[PDB]
Amino acid sequence: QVNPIDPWIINNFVQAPQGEFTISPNNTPGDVLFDLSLGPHLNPFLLHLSQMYNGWVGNMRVRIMLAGCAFTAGKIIVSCIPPGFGSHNLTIAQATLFPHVIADVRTLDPIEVPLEDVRNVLFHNNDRNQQTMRLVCMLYTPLRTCGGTGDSFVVAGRVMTCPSPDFNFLFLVPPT
Amino acid sequence: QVNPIDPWIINNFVQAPQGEFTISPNNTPGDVLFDLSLGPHLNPFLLHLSQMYNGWVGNMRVRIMLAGCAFTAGKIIVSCIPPGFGSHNLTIAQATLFPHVIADVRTLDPIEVPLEDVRNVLFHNNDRNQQTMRLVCMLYTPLRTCGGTGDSFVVAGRVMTCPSPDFNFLFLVPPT
Amino acid sequence: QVNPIDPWIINNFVQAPQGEFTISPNNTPGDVLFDLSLGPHLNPFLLHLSQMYNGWVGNMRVRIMLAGCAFTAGKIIVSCIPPGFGSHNLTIAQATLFPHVIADVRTLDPIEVPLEDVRNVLFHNNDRNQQTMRLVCMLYTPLRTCGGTGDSFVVAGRVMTCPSPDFNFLFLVPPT
Amino acid sequence: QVNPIDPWIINNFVQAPQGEFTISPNNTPGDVLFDLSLGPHLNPFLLHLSQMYNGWVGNMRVRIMLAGCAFTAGKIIVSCIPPGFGSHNLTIAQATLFPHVIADVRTLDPIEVPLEDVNQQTMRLVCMLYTPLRTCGGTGDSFVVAGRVMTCPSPDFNFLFLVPPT
Amino acid sequence: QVNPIDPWIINNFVQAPQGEFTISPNNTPGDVLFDLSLGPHLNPFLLHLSQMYNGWVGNMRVRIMLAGCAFTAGKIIVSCIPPGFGSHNLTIAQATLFPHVIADVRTLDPIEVPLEDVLFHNNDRNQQTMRLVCMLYTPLRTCGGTGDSFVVAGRVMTCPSPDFNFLFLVPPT
């Protein structure tokens, strides 16, 4: 068994670039906040390291934080839609059918998506979009300020990620 | 033993169609918010599958979320009234006598009804209303905004459901 | 084995001098709130005692409290940057890469930084800045009052510290 | 404790950048033509680690290949001088004091430079033209001897500290 | 189950078409000599057998013969390019990162390139296949009587491996 991933990395979560999303009171329910394709490029670590290899296996945990104050109430649905289903047919009711975790903007704790569907990972080359299991978040419930004159408020949100302990790389490639 | 239900389904909760209910400050206490008859048709899954069969046995867990912000205080009573008792005689005090769970609109966590009364399920054909153990929710306590000028606020609520591990189907029928 | 540190000290946390920092709504995200170099001088205890010795080994736990009321939402990043990386290149995204713990201003509980990286401590003389593993805190998320007319509010914060059970002193020196 | 570097590097060699040196006939004896700092940056893969990681411990095994017609006569002197002593004022004789090996430009088998078993001011390594190169019957001054170097890390290399990529 | 190809082909080697490459002293190091993609088309016998079998499995042993006298001094490096990485700007410095074999122009006996052991592949143009390419590692310099142009000629031939076999039968097209 070969594991070139530092044990510290798997035990810590690091913010992913382009993982910053904002929720506004004018966002209609069901609107797509952020649609980031799960992959090693999310973590700043394993992006530099991934240049060594081309094929990778396993999953990667993702957790999201909502920096939302009280007086604003709403729910955000996070669904890991399998590839190919992304189209206008997607709706709030249908989103929950895929694996998901319900989150409240008022929560003061990180939310962890249950992306444990290893389903016997086959292969993932870093040159194709095939089987890029995407993550999409939508405003499950309309956002209201409860008459707190806080219309000019945006619920800032950030997403971190850490590699799974089963993560590994197969083939070596020279750095580009 | 035959269990044609995916183990993932029983381990996950999915929103039920027509399971969206709203609570308004003008709702008098004891008003019926939603009265949905428990059955396989609640879950989007087991509705397509139920077309195969006609008779089903077992119970199905139901949990409700209240997307309510602070500054509004109230309580909602959920009672699984046995069939035949639905009439004007029903009142807030009498509702709690049946199995129930008390919920607070300010709660930030899902509420699970204790619908564990298997009581040796007899049979349930999908052509009759007999023994359709209904679920009714009422405003246990009057809703007040605590002078937060949030009168134009509605506590959005959604209900999910998952099949019980004991759920099963008896007889096969061709799809319609 | 010689341990001249009182067992009570390691089991209790004491406020550190100059460990008071304030967060204002005008603080732009990424601004450095406080940058205190970890060392025995943080704790009022072990400062008088450190006069006896010159070299010390081990780490020291640090926890921070945020005396912040509701209606204000924000996140503060605490990163123990290794020495030599302090410069303009530091940014919010890069800060999380080092060991860190995410904190919410609304939290009502002390936050403990995971400064468990003993990494086989080598030596630390009390006359040089070498390997003075610093602690830096930055406003991870912009601070907003949610229209609560609380602009004239500052989130007071204090930091305590206790010596680790592995803390020890090597060489004796006369008091100065 | 863990070994981030893949074992494939341990059992195989790879050329290093700036390791191109040609023993031109118009070169005075003792002239410097191949100077390396003996650091992790030599191996292309190891250079990649230094971008991410900070602390490195261990040693490599430097291997040198020479292209020889089996006719031209010449020798190269390799001496891994300790850090600090190295400077411009370093005659060929002085380098002979430190550990060294003598190689012939006509040697088919590459020479394995001996390195003592073991960061800043690291141990250095320099090479000079011990003996001038002559065709000896080639009647041509355009001929040159190509030289390539590849460093393979020893099976004890590892890192200590963690740093964001830069 | 039953290997169709006769054992005679296995015991010998066949020159693949367009397997001829030329090395000249005036050719500076940095220009590729020949690009090869492993497949049944390399062996003419296997090329005609593709009609009877759409799917082929196994590997092929590839050997290279280089002709030259004892005066020349040069080295030839054979580099393995993983699929999907080939680029126009393929210099020699990074060409040795992949597994390779060291060879010289003064060799007499043929040198066998080490091929990694290894899934059924259809007859379509599936780019996923082990690619082979050689690069002029060092310049070819003559140490004799100033040869104006001593063209070093080499030939590449491959034969089916013992494990090579066809699994799916398809009538000839």
Residue numbers in the entry:
A (entry chain A), B (entry chain A), C (entry chain A): 48 to 223
D (entry chain C): 48 to 165, 176 to 223
E (entry chain B): 48 to 165, 169 to 223
Which sentences from the paper describe this structure?
Noroviruses are single-stranded RNA viruses that cause pandemic outbreaks of acute gastroenteritis. Norovirus capsids are made of 180 identical copies of the VP1 protein arranged in a T = 3 icosahedral particle. The icosahedral asymmetric unit contains three quasi-equivalent VP1 monomers (designated A, B, and C). Each monomer associates with another monomer to form P domain dimers (in either A–B or C–C configuration).
